[PDB]
């Protein structure tokens with residue numbers, strides 16, 4: 001299941017869906033694990049989120065060119081943070097089209113992260129406009145609302161029952177909601193539940209700080225956010 005490649009770990013979730021794990025060394029804390037997704041669409045590769053650093057992000061591309069040997073069409077990130085947008089330069093240097101939430105690109109310079117080349121707009125229902133998200137294929141982007149951040153988005157993999165909750169949704173064994181610094185203590189539960197309503201056929205909920213859990217993770221996250 002878990003393959004150690006360089007300094008990252010890769011785990012196959014589905015025939016064309018792989019999960020990558022980035023690690024950050026924090027002096028006095030340890031190694032922070034951040035999960036991501038790699039989806040193969042026929043002859044092209046699609047990546048969700050980057051690593052903690054451009055270096056680690058490039059290592060992912062090396063793995064892609066090794067096991068998949070296919071070119072990456074575009075990359076979509078969840079929110080403007082170093083835990084997901086730490087390798088934006090690597091994507092640009094490789095000539096990969098970066099797509100992110102319109103707000104994420106605005107918060108990027110503030111947080112000190114490189115803004116994406118394209119911006120995604122979302123309707124009142126939370127669904128991304130097809131115009132801003134062209135040739136995405138199975139990458140279905142949905143914006144639940146203010147949760148971990150005000151720009152956090154979720155990505156579902158069409159054709160499968162796999163949904164990426166980013167750093168918003170936590171596992172059913174989580175004790176905390178993770179980072180509550182830039183988080184919202186009012187719409188957190190609503191946003192978490194919105195994700196479950198958006199992708200009801202998704203049985204595999206992949207997060208960025210834990211392994212892919214069942215739909216129980218969504219309910220657990222919602223229950224934890226209900227106490228805010």
Ligand SMILES: O=c1c(O)c(-c2cc(O)c(O)c(O)c2)oc2cc(O)cc(O)c12
Nearest residue numbers: 029032081082083084167176178179209
């Ligand atoms: O996603 C993040 C995250 O999980 C943590 C984190 C740090 C800890 O020390 C923990 O104990 C923990 O559970 C999470 O760092 C972060 C710091 C940021 O500036 C932004 C983030 O998005 C994260």
Ligand SMILES: [Zn+2]
Nearest residue numbers: 081082083084
């Ligand atoms: Zn973040």
